[PDB]
Design a protein around this ligand. Structure first.
Ligand SMILES: CC[C@H](C)[C@H]1CN(c2nc3cc(Cl)ccc3o2)CCCN1C(=O)c1cc(C)ccc1-n1nccn1
Ligand SMILES: CC(C)CCC[C@@H](C)[C@H]1CC[C@H]2[C@@H]3CC=C4C[C@@H](O)CC[C@]4(C)[C@H]3CC[C@]12C
Ligand SMILES: CCCCCCCC/C=C\CCCCCCCC(=O)O
Length: 503
């Protein structure tokens, strides 16, 4: 009967050294040093510099502290156990160290989850985004409490054993540390639940969040503020406007301009032409000048040219223009009209506002976010009557100064063209953090759900291969904590500044 008994009696002193022990050691030591130092720096940057103290960065500090815990405690024990195949610490640590590992996993996952949630409101629902440092402190304490409470079961089940259970002879060369379960099926439940809780579900939810985030952020990387600025224009706006109107063949007046595709139902030139017809009566039409620029279907080009022929203060341009002359136009006219129906970005508003042109535009899409109070006139889309009223309001305003109004336009457009860059880069960094985490913990999660549920990894030569696989998976799990500070290095100048500050 006694095969295991006797073959262990024979083969127990059969120590087999591995060829690349020094490689594994070098790997874990590199990780130890890099992770420890880098997470120290991540904490110090936020703790010294007041401008680093953002909710995002507080959660990142939590991540780094969990990483430091793991690096300080569990990495050495894993190295020793993966080198010697024996548990060289006490029975108490056999419970404590795996407990701390599980808790750190929990904390890292929950912290990434709140980071994703905060960014999700801030980007996808900015009006509902009520977030402060008080909320973050409370949330972090809750994360730690829940993580500590929920991983007590592992600490309970870990045990240090050696010889065969139920064996009279207790002679041994070493003892090991593994999970002791009195139930033969509930372990499957535990490890399934903890695969799903600590990995699957939170990663899927954060994937949803970041999909929606990056979909709100596509195509939003600002305008070239170094090209769109008055610095390359000559003279004063008065002389520039006089000169433009003289080149086109008009006397000085309040100039409105539209540039865009002659599209019916999108860029809204039809609405502008109809509003020009509405204003062709009245009395104040004589004080106004309009320029209409673009290309499209024959109907709208023809109707624009008809209005040009009818009225001497209306000019139409279908020639192909350089970006530089568009710049000069924006810095010469008085207002710009954007009668679009579905404008999703509003690059025209930004480009024209950085040059001082005041925007009159439909209250749709990106425009509503750019054009605020004290910096433009907003109109119900598709209504040429309200557009005519807006033009008349612009005229009444033009009988005054407007200079500070244009400077406000400039400030707004420059701040908006730089905030979305910051959003884009922050989101990129956090997505990369999440990806590194999700890959680092994929192998070992798969291996545990297989070992603990679908009976495997216990037979034939599937015992040396298993050794190699788990050794690598452990190392990778720990390399996570060296990787995250490296991400922070490369993808945020705000941390690079303070990594330099230390030397
Ligand atoms: C998070 C607890 C996890 C359930 C651990 C708990 N345990 C255990 N043995 C340990 C020996 C040492 Cl020296 C240090 C820590 C240890 O933790 C044995 C049960 C499997 N288990 C890992 O296979 C496991 C092991 C390590 C080293 C890292 C991650 C792991 N991981 N698994 C699922 C997700 N991440
Ligand atoms: C027992 C021995 C091996 C423990 C070694 C721990 C080492 C890696 C830890 C302990 C204290 C740490 C240092 C604490 C303070 C600073 C100052 C900071 O401006 C740069 C990081 C730096 C320089 C840390 C680097 C990493 C560090 C030196
Ligand atoms: C793990 C989850 C990571 C999510 C990845 C980021 C997803 C970003 C998706 C793209 C946004 C879709 C942009 C719309 C394209 C319109 C252009 C066109 O119609 O040709």
């Amino acid at each position: 009967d006694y095969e295991d008994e006797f073959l262990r009696y024979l083969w127990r002193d059969y120590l087999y050294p591995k060829q690349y022990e020094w490689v594994l050691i070098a790997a874990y030591v590199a990780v130890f040093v890099v992770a420890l130092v880098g997470n120290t720096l991540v904490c110090l940057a936020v703790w010294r510099n007041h401008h680093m103290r953002t909710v995002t960065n507080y959660f990142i500090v939590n991540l780094s502290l969990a990483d430091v815990l793991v690096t300080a405690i569990c990495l050495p024990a894993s190295l020793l156990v993966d080198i010697t195949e024996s548990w060289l610490f006490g029975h108490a640590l056999c419970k404590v160290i795996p407990y701390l590992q599980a808790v750190s996993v929990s904390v890292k996952v929950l912290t990434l989850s709140f980071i994703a949630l905060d960014r999700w409101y801030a980007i996808c629902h900015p009006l509902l985004f009520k977030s402060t440092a008080r909320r973050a402190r409370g949330s972090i304490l809750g994360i730690w409490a829940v993580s500590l409470a929920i991983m007590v079961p592992q600490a309970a089940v870990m045990e240090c054993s050696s010889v065969l259970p139920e064996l009279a002879n207790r002679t041994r060369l070493f003892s090991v540390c593994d999970e002791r379960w009195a139930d033969d099926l509930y372990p499957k439940i535990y490890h399934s639940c903890f695969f799903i809780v600590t990995y699957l579900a939170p990663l899927g939810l954060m994937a949803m969040a970041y999909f929606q985030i990056f979909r709100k952020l596509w195509g939003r990387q600002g305008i070239d503020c170094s090209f769109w600025n008055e610095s390359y224009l000559t003279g004063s706006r008065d002389e520039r406007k006089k000169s433009l109107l003289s080149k086109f063949g008009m006397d000085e007046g309040v100039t409105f301009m539209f540039i865009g595709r002659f599209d019916r139902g999108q860029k809204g030139v039809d609405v502008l032409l109809k509003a020009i017809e509405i204003l062709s009566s009245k009395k104040e039409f004589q004080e106004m000048r309009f320029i209409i620029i673009g290309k499209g279907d024959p109907e709208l080009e023809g109707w624009a040219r008809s209005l040009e022929e009818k009225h001497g203060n209306v000019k139409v341009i279908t020639e192909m223009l350089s970006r530089e002359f568009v710049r000069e136009l924006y810095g010469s006219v008085d207002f710009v009209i954007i009668p679009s129906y579905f404008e999703p970005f509003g690059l025209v508003a930004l480009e024209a506002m950085c040059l001082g042109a005041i925007p009159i535009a439909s209250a749709v899409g990106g425009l509503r976010d750019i054009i605020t109070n004290e910096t433009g006139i907003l109109v119900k889309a598709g209504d040429p009557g309200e557009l005519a009223n807006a033009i008349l309001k612009a005229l009444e305003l033009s009988r005054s100064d407007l200079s500070k109004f244009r400077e406000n336009c400039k400030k707004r457009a420059m701040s908006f063209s730089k905030q979305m860059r910051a959003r884009r880069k922050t989101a990129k960094m956090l997505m990369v953090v999440l990806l590194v985490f999700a890959l680092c913990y994929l192998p070992i999660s798969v291996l545990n759900i297989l070992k603990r549920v679908f009976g495997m990894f216990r037979q034939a030569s599937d015992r040396e291969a298993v050794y190699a696989c788990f050794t690598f998976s452990h190392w990778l799990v720990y390399a996570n904590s060296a990787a995250n500070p490296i991400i922070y290095n490369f993808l945020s100048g705000k941390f690079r500044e303070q990594f330099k500050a230390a030397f």
